[PDB]
Design a protein around this ligand. Structure first.
Ligand code: HEC
Ligand code: HEC
Ligand code: HEC
Ligand code: HEC
Length: 87
């Protein structure tokens, strides 16, 4: 199941999108992720370094990734790091 559909089961499309319609820039959506999950400054060692430089959707591609899919690191880092190497 796509992560978008997983969420829409409990919350509808409006769980993330104002009036069920995507925003111009993803701000409203990022505000919603944080409203339910908390902020990056309070998360684990993979999440916290990105506080102030990424929104959630820069790693979690919610309409493309299935439930259980972990984002990986190679699209922005060239050193071979993984979530396991950092955690
Ligand atoms: C309920 C079934 C829906 C529908 C009809 C849409 N969404 Fe989402 N959406 C979310 C995020 C972070 C994005 C950016 C890209 C991504 O991460 O996949 C989107 C994108 C869209 C679009 C694309 C607009 C475009 O410019 O191409 C559309 C048409 C769209 N959505 C419709 C986040 C979420 C959610 C958070 C968990 C949830 C729930 C939904 N979307 C649900 C739906
Ligand atoms: C904004 C685009 C996001 C993103 C990136 C994520 N969420 Fe949610 N989410 C909510 C609840 C109740 C759960 C299940 C309980 C839990 O896992 O703690 C989730 C789950 C997730 C996952 C994990 C999926 C899995 O089981 O592997 C992920 C990666 C995730 N979310 C990202 C609740 C909410 C919301 C409440 C209304 C909102 C809004 C979002 N989540 C938005 C996002
Ligand atoms: C913005 C605030 C968010 C939110 C709401 C979530 N993420 Fe991530 N995420 C990433 C990776 C590699 C994993 C798997 C490894 C790990 O747990 O560190 C995850 C996992 C999650 C979960 C499930 C685990 C849990 O503790 O519940 C959830 C619910 C989740 N994320 C939500 C990768 C990234 C990023 C890459 C740099 C970024 C940015 C985010 N996540 C941001 C967010
Ligand atoms: C782009 C969308 C990224 C993805 C995917 C990942 N990271 Fe990242 N990371 C990104 C930025 C813009 C920054 C700020 C500093 C910079 O490199 O420009 C970071 C920073 C980190 C850091 C802190 C600095 C460092 O010690 O290298 C860590 C520890 C880090 N990132 C880890 C990490 C991991 C484990 C990732 C995959 C799960 C990952 N990043 C993906 C941008 C992006």
């Amino acid at each position: 199941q796509k992560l978008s559909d997983f969420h829409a089961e409990s919350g509808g499309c409006e769980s993330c999108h104002k009036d069920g319609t995507p925003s111009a820039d993803g701000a409203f959506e990022f505000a919603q992720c944080q409203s339910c999950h908390g902020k990056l400054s309070e998360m684990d060692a993979v999440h916290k370094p990105h506080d102030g430089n990424l929104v959630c959707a820069d790693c979690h591609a919610v309409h493309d990734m299935n439930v259980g899919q972990k984002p990986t690191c190679e699209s922005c880092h060239d050193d071979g790091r993984t979530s396991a190497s950092v955690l």
